[PDB]
Amino acid sequence: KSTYRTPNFDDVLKENNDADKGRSYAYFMVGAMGLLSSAGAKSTVETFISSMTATADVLAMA
């Protein structure tokens, strides 16, 4: 068999590749994952930093 014959890939290929929209769906999901994890990173940092503020008993004697 010759090396110039490409094997069968028709199980996995698209409607038409349509590069306008093969890039659309992959990058909406990569953008959503970066949006949620940047919000989660903020909430984590602000939870740890606020623990260093004056406690309830110190504010009661304020």
């Binding site: 309830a56 008993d57 009661a60 004697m61």
Partner: protein, 50 residues
């Protein structure tokens, strides 16, 4: 006392419950001990001293 406000009782209610108990104050101008009523930053007292 303060942790009951907003959970089971009103602020005005808890201030009146605490004032029914006496707490050790700091000594007077000559070093003799004093007493005072309770405030919100105090802790709920127990029946026995030891």
């Amino acid at each position: 006392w303060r942790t009951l406000v907003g959970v089971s009782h009103t602020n005005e209610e808890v201030r009146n419950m605490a004032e029914e108990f006496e707490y050790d104050d700091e000594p007077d101008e000559q070093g003799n001990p004093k007493k005072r009523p309770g405030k919100l930053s105090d802790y709920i007292p127990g029946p026995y001293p030891n």
